[PDB]
């Protein structure tokens, strides 16, 4: 017996279809799950609308992660009452049968689900552009000084459609997030989307989320992760294949430089004992001059050489090794990849 019969051996609440809570919510069905717990579709009888209830595991580490999340969501939502900046809306929260419960607006499929639905062949450049514009607008809002929030776990699965037939999105899952100058974490970001400064053990700021965004946008159009490392050494080597050896001024100050690199007599750095550095060109991953990914966009509208050159230019600015010169949200939104 766990939690008087209400919980399973994984710390999760055992969902019961049609259960009534608090003279208010009628639980319908499970609609998603993850490390944190479960998400159910429920009818809110007071507000007369469907909601998504995120039921956190009954275990102190998961409870405290979600308490951090609640505080950040309350801060963000207070500064976007019109819901124009692409962050999910937390309506309220409560404790129920020893589980913290977060009540959200209901959302639809995530962007990994969309990739699966393309048979892992990618969405169009036009749809990629729509997702990119909304994500850059969200990053601009997170960078406002009263927020200064670093999401720290951006990936396709954490970006959700509002409605199944439309391109509008919201970002979810602030459990691993932090604020500039209240930064605590040395180990952060899911591996495929992890920035060079984090891999190298260096100081970090909101620019880590822009790195993740550049990786995400390439994957949305090709269908496959850009840098699919199996461990940190493989991750760094995959980044180097595309982007070359990082600048010496960075490696000279990196606590973990020698996990990946060695310094030569002339002061230059090379890899420790892959395609040679910088020879896996993004120009060819995207298929700029050869019909897009797999050549499959040849003959389609919305996929010109000129369009692809603008996309490539913006991505390479998001993937700058130097976090001080990497493109920032304000300037990303002004880039000619985006439309008047």
Ligand X SMILES: CN(c1nccc(-c2cnn3ncccc23)n1)C1CC1
Annotated binding site: 31-39, 54, 104-107
Least distance in Å: CB of 256 to ligand X? Answer: 30
Least distance in Å: CB of 117 to ligand X? Answer: 15
Nearer to ligand X, 3 or 108 (CB): 108
Interface mask toward ligand X for 71-90; x: CB under 6 A: -----------------x--
Catalytic positions, written as ranges: 153
| CA 89, 156, 200, 133 torsion-angle sign | negative
Could you say which of 7, 173, 209, 219 contacts ligand X (CB under 6 A)?
173
Nearer to ligand X, 103 or 315 (CB): 103
Could you say which of 27, 40, 42, 52 contacts ligand X (CB under 6 A)?
52
Nearer to ligand X, 72 or 286 (CB): 72
Could you say which of 27, 54, 134, 315 contacts ligand X (CB under 6 A)?
54
Least distance in Å: CB of 98 to ligand X? Answer: 20
Cα separation, 17 vs 3, whole angstroms: 19
Query: 80 and 69 in contact (C-beta within 8 Å)?
Result: no
Q: Coil, helix or strand for 236?
A: helix
Q: Which stretch binds ligand X (CB under 6 A): 57-65, 102-110, 126-134, 299-307?
A: 102-110
Q: Which stretch binds ligand X (CB under 6 A): 16-24, 92-100, 103-111, 274-282?
A: 103-111
Buried b (16+ CB within 10 A) or exposed e, 217-256: bbbbbbbebbbebeeeeebbbbbbbbbebbeeebbeebee
Least distance in Å: CB of 172 to ligand X? Answer: 4
Q: Is 215 in the site for ligand X (CB under 6 A)?
A: no
Nearer to ligand X, 104 or 227 (CB): 104
Nearer to ligand X, 151 or 312 (CB): 151
Cα separation, 331 vs 99, whole angstroms: 42
Query: 151 and 185 in contact (C-beta within 8 Å)?
Result: no
Q: Is 107 in the site for ligand X (CB under 6 A)?
A: yes
Cα separation, 338 vs 307, whole angstroms: 10
Output phi, psi for 184, to 5 deg: -130, -30
Closest chain position to ligand X (CB): 32
Query: 230 and 285 in contact (C-beta within 8 Å)?
Result: no
Q: Give the full edge-to-edge strand order of the sheet including 99-104.
A: 20-21, 25-34, 37-44, 49-56, 99-104, 90-96
Nearer to ligand X, 158 or 237 (CB): 158
Q: Which of 135, 69, 130 is nearest to 104 (CA)?
A: 69
Structure tokens at 152: 């720290």
Interface mask toward ligand X for 6-45; x: CB under 6 A: -------------------------xx-x----x------
- Residue 272, Cα to own-chain centre: how many angstroms? 30
Q: Is 295 in the site for ligand X (CB under 6 A)?
A: no
Could you say which of 13, 25, 85, 104 contacts ligand X (CB under 6 A)?
104
Residues in CB range of 272: below 8 A, 6 or more apart: 258, 260, 261, 262
Residues that bind ligand X (CB under 6 A): 31-32, 34, 39, 52, 54, 88, 104, 106-107, 172-173
């Amino acid at each position: 017996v766990y939690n008087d019969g209400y919980d399973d051996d994984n710390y999760d609440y055992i969902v019961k279809n049609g259960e009534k809570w608090m003279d208010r919510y009628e639980i319908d069905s499970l609609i998603g799950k993850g490390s944190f717990g479960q998400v159910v579709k429920a009818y809110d009888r007071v507000e007369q609308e469907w909601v998504a209830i995120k039921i956190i595991k009954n275990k102190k580490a998961f409870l405290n992660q979600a308490q951090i999340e609640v505080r950040l969501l309350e801060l963000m939502n207070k500064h976007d009452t019109e819901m124009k900046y692409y962050i999910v809306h937390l309506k309220r929260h409560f404790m129920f049968r020893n589980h913290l419960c977060l009540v959200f607006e209901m959302l639809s499929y995530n962007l990994y689900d969309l990739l699966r639905n393309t048979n892992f062949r990618g969405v169009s450049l036009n749809l990629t552009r729509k997702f990119a514009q909304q994500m850059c607008t969200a990053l601009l809002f997170l960078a406002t000084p009263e927020l200064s929030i670093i999401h720290c776990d951006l990936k396709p699965e954490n970006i959700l459609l509002c409605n199944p037939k439309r391109s509008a999105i919201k970002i979810v899952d602030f459990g691993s997030s932090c604020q500039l100058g209240q930064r605590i974490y040395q180990y952060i970001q899911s591996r495929f989307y992890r920035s060079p400064e984090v891999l190298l053990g260096m100081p970090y700021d909101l620019a880590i989320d822009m790195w993740s965004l550049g990786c995400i946008l390439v994957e949305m159009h090709t269908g496959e992760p850009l840098f699919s490392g199996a461990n940190e050494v493989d991750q760094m080597n995959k980044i180097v294949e595309v982007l070359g050896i990082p600048p010496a001024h960075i490696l000279d100050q990196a606590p973990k430089a020698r996990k990946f690199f060695e310094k030569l007599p002339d002061g230059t750095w090379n890899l420790k004992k892959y395609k040679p550095p910088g020879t896996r060109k993004l120009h060819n991953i995207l298929g700029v001059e050869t019909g897009g990914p797999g050549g499959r966009r040849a003959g389609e509208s919305g996929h010109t050489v000129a369009d692809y050159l603008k996309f490539k230019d913006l991505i390479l600015r998001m993937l700058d090794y130097d976090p001080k010169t990497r493109i920032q949200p304000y300037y990303a939104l002004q880039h000619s990849f985006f439309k008047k």
